[PDB]
Design goal:
Blueprint (H helix, E strand, L loop, with lengths): L6 H13 L6 E2 L2 E9 L6 E7 L2 E2 L2 E5 L10 H8 L2 E6 L2 E10 L2 H14 L2 H6 L8 E4 L1
Antiparallel strand pairs: 1-2, 2-3, 2-6, 4-5, 5-8, 6-7, 7-8
Catalytic activity: oxidized coenzyme F420-(gamma-L-Glu)(n) + a quinol + H(+) = reduced coenzyme F420-(gamma-L-Glu)(n) + a quinone
Organism: Mycolicibacterium smegmatis (strain ATCC 700084 / mc(2)155) (Mycobacterium smegmatis)
Protein name: Nitroreductase
Length: 137
């Protein structure tokens, strides 16, 4: 799997891998999960850490790279290759399926996402489109 070209993201990914767990690796003091994705064009595996948004064993991937409204590359990758892995702590869930949410189901998980990571709300006030949310089931 490939590490992010972004320095702080790569650094946090390396820390997860050296520890064997996401526990203790934080953004704004909040927990994160490590997703394994597949690039739409390269076919390469890519490690993508995201904020932890979880409910009854399912996880959300919220596609908002801070103050940049354009979609992250991993958004196109997960739409092209819905099969992902998710690591929460030292537990790896392989071969999960990502699905983009719409309507009221998106709302249910957006609420949970902002509960977990309040800055998601601020990122939304800077785009006119709803931020994409994937459920991982």
């Amino acid at each position: 799997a490939e590490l992010s070209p972004t320095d702080w993201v790569r650094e946090q990914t390396e820390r997860i891998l050296e520890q064997g767990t996401t526990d203790g690796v934080h953004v704004l003091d909040r927990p994160i999960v490590l997703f394994t994705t597949t690039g739409a064009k390269s076919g390469k595996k890519r490690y993508v850490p995201l904020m932890r948004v979880e409910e009854n064993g399912k996880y959300a991937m919220v596609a908002s790279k801070g103050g940049d409204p354009k979609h992250p590359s991993w958004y196109f990758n997960v739409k092209a290759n819905p099969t992902v892995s998710v690591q929460d702590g030292d537990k790896v869930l392989p071969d999960r399926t990502a699905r983009e949410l719409e309507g009221e189901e998106r709302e249910h998980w957006w609420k949970l996402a902002v509960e977990a990571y309040p800055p998601y709300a601020e990122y939304q006030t800077k785009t006119d489109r709803l931020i994409p949310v994937f459920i991982v089931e």
